[model samples]
Target: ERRYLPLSQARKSGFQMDWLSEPHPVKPTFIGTQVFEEYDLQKLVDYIDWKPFFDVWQLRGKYPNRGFPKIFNDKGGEARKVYDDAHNMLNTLISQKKLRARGVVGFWPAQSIQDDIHLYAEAAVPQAAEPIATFYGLRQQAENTEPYYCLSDFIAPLHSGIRDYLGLFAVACFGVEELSKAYEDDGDDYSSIMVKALGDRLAEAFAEELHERVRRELWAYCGSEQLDVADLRRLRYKGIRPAPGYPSQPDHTEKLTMWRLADIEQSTGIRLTESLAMAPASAVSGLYFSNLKSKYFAVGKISKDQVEDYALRKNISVAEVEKWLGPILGYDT
Candidate 1:
């Protein structure tokens, strides 16, 4: 019989951090950045506190919301604590002019009935333009209705930006579905499955381009020279959900995901048959708002001149120049 080797030790032996590497390309290193280290964590936390930051970007101004209602089972009080600590830490960094980076994190906005669902709509359906909800789909609030802030509600999974399909396969195969299946059949090979599934969703060319970009831009910032482009892109894309600075597109989805609503029905046991199964406007508003805010954080650093440059460059209202530099930990007028 062959001696068993724990994967932890075996995997670690092959890790080398390269700032960029192509898709399915041989990665010489395999470094894993901590999902949300303290510095970056503080950045996100502080971001929520910056009313002007949101205001400058017209986040709450454009879309007012109360956010998602707290679920009864969420008794740990972790969310409140997260808000409190994050706010306090952000204040400290800003006032003291301390620059401590925690890498990258994510955000999405608005309110919803369901906080968790993981089915990607297949592309075959006529109305299947974006990857719609897999299960019942989440509903959002509307204008002149009870406002909800899903950005504060639908928190991003750590390192979600680069994660393909955002771990849905893992949740179905290992998390929920596994419970109903036999233990032996529910093996923990979900990682490979997830990787392959994600790879399949994205075209090889796009994946390769994305993989290369991750290795070049995000890897250099993460303080790890070992991970390849595939590793870095997966990490960045999974952890962070980037939003545009303003409402340019009405609805958007990652280019890599190609599934439609009907495909979801055929591939798995899920379907979205009505408007009730679709995302609401408040949700759409909140999600984009949150993404923009988080992107503001991840895209750290800006000189006063840069702020002025942004205003002039975009021809945007420049009333709050200081607010633009909030994520860098300090900004003195």
Candidate 2:
């Protein structure tokens, strides 16, 4: 069996955060952005890990690290049969042009100003301090710890006079809208479930492919890196690309800023619902950091003070912030 982070318990154990003191990350390998107006859908298919796909089919398996051939042999076993069926259907869908992909990535020069990361319009001195957009970060406030950690702690500080950089990404499994509508209208439950599940997994696979290229080609931070698909699936790499509503940054509202920065909706079919959940049910986005120490962590729970300060920085109300971050609050609203 698998489990998730002890989030609610994390809240019960800590107070709210106030500040950060740790240093930021080194400079990115290079600067600028990469856009995928129409990333090949089939290229992403090779990156797919069928482990979760099995789970969706109510089949079980060991780690996908074993490789598909080893895990699903030609013995006509249930798992093998399921894999064959899904594989054929997925390939057929792609061959029939029923899937498409799009992505956008940006590596912006940034500085840590107080509890936030300010993205600049230029990498050099023409307006380095002026932010085109800001992302507010949260710090952990634990009584037992001395050095509090914040997401901003990993970016270059304004006083440091360093023009450090960060990356952002948003990828979508296109063609899902039409596929889902056709299947649903035909009352094809089996096809409907298969389409939805495959769409979701492909979104993640596309993200994985994009991340690998970013590390190796776009950012070139680890250009000499050599890791297999299994290793990539296990996340054997530096830095992070944590998404909104995940533990690292639980506020979904920040996606508004990300969307605007990338012109995500205009550039692609992916859009957010009123609550900020990406539509097509197969879109993925993340805030990228190239810090060697930029490990994925939970802000856990924060105090009312932290929420209020964050609200002030974001120009949003504390009440609205409370509604979105209910899971990570240390105190009652």
Per-residue lDDT over 1-333 for candidate 1, one digit per residue giving the tens place of the 0 to 100 score: 222222233223312222123121121122221121222222223112222332322332233223322331343353344335434533553345342221121111111222222323222221222324321111122112222222222323222322212211100111212221332254423222222222222222222332233433433222233544445444443223333222221112311121242232234322222322211111111111112122212222323443454345334555543443343312355
Model 2 spans with C-alpha error above 4 angstroms: 1-33, 59-77, 123-128, 144-146
Model 2 scores worst on lDDT over the 10 consecutive residues at: 1-10
For each candidate, the alpha-carbon lDDT, in order, equals 0.26, 0.74
- Scored by lDDT, the top model is 2
Write model 2 residue lDDT over 1-333, tens digit each, in one string.
Answer: 222223233333433222244344445555555678787777888898888887876543332212333434333365666667678878898888778888788877877865678887654652435677788887665343334556776777776755577789999887876887897787665566667778888999999988888888887778888898899988888878999888878888889989888787877767889868888779899998876667777777777777887888888898898998899887766
Best candidate, TM-score: 2
